[PDB]
Amino acid sequence: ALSLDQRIQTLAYEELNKAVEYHQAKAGTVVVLDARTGEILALVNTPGRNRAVTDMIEPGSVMKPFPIAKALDSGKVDTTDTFNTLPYKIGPATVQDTHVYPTLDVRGIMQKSSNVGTSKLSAMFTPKEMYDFYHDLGVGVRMHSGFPGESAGVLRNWRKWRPIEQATMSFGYGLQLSLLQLARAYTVLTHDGELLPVSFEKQAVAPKGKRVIKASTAKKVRELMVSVTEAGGSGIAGAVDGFDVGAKTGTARKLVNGRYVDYKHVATFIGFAPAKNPRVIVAVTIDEPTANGYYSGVVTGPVFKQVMGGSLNILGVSPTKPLT
Numbered sequence: 537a538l539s540l541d542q543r544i545q546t547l548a549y550e551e552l553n554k555a556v557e558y559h560q561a562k563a564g565t566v567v568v569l570d571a572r573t574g575e576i577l578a579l580v581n582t583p584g585r586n587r588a589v590t591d592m593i594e595p596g597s598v599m600k601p602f603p604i605a606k607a608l609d610s611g612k613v614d615t616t617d618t619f620n621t622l623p624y625k626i627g628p629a630t631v632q633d634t635h636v637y638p639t640l641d642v643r644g645i646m647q648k649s650s651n652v653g654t655s656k657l658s659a660m661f662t663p664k665e666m667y668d669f670y671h672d673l674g675v676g677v678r679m680h681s682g683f684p685g686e687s688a689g690v691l692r693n694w695r696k697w698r699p700i701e702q703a704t705m706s707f708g709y710g711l712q713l714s715l716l717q718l719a720r721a722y723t724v725l726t727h728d729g730e731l732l733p734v735s736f737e738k739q740a741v742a743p744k745g746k747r748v749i750k751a752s753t754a755k756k757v758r759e760l761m762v763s764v765t766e767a768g769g770s771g772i773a774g775a776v777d778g779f780d781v782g783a784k785t786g787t788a789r790k791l792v793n794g795r796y797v798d799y800k801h802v803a804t805f806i807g808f809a810p811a812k813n814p815r816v817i818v819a820v821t822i823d824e825p826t827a828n829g830y831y832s833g834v835v836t837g838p839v840f841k842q843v844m845g846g847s848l849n850i851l852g853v854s855p856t857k858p859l860t
């Protein structure tokens with residue numbers, strides 16, 4: 537039997553279509569995963585191929601939790617550690633934030649989506665250490681979901697990395713993943729540090745995962761990510777009434793469309809809830825929005841909010857705080 541829940545599939549389809557129409561976008565995808573099993577509860581695309589598995593993107597901001605997790609897991613960084621987050625140079629290249637802050641701690645780096653802060657955390661590790669970590673998350677790795685045309689994405693050999701490329705990878709550029717690979721990678725955060733296999737078939741036994749970080753680290757990262765959907769957070773448009781939600785949002789770049797070259801901006805939102813004890817991962821992409829907003833949170837947050845809220849309701853999960 538398929539793991540897909542027709543109620544969630546219908547909800548995802550309707551909310552996706554609503555956003556694609558409103559923002560006059562080219563295409564879109566929603567993936568909903570069981571956060572503790574890797575089973576696909578919904579997977580919808582606009583008409584055409586199964587872009588969730590075929591289309592790889594440079595993920596942008598949604599990748600940031602991972603170098604943060606690696607840094608915390610290593611013991612080299614504490615959540616309260618503060619970093620100089622002013623723009624800086626690597627050779628002639630500049631790494632800078634959208635909103636400039638002189639200093640941020642790790643919670644702030646997550647909350648504000650700081651490219652500088654994330655790059656500095658990554659810079660504490662060798663190219664090999666970072667590559668091995670990204671590889672362990674499934675970047676450049678086949679999922680073997682049994683979907684046809686499944687992209688492995690791109691993770692360049694660390695032996696070829698320049699310092700600027702290590703830096704840009706930490707904030708989601710210079711490596712490429714499909715939306716389903718991104719959703720899968722988020723299971724390290726939701727399933728207490730263990731990467732789950734992805735399946736569209738109902739699983740008869742407990743899927744065993746590969747441990748990537750400690751469970752304590754995964755828990756701390758989920759906590760940090762709640763700041764993204766609270767006041768002051770880059771992902772407020774994706775807050776879900778009655779729940780705490782860990783999430784990231786940002787603009788990804790599509791360089792490959794099917795079997796062809798491309799260059800498109802893709803609004804992205806991915807997250808999980810309830811944040812302390814997650815049941816669901818929802819991931820959303822909308823390709824080339826051209827109306828009523830072009831910043832990613834406003835385009836995709838509302839899709840995430842409705843799909844997440846509705847999925848939790850459908851599965852019977854009680855709100856953890858009174859509704860506003």
Ligand SMILES: *C(=O)[C@@H](NC(=O)/C(=N\OC)c1csc(N)n1)[C@@H]1N=C(C(=O)O)C(=C)CS1
Nearest residue numbers: 596597634649651770785786787831832833
């Ligand atoms: C993550 O996606 C992050 N985006 C960026 O830092 C970039 N642009 O943001 C406007 C960026 C850095 S290098 C490059 N090619 N683009 C956060 N995302 C957004 C967004 O909606 O794109 C923000 C508004 C906050 S910063």
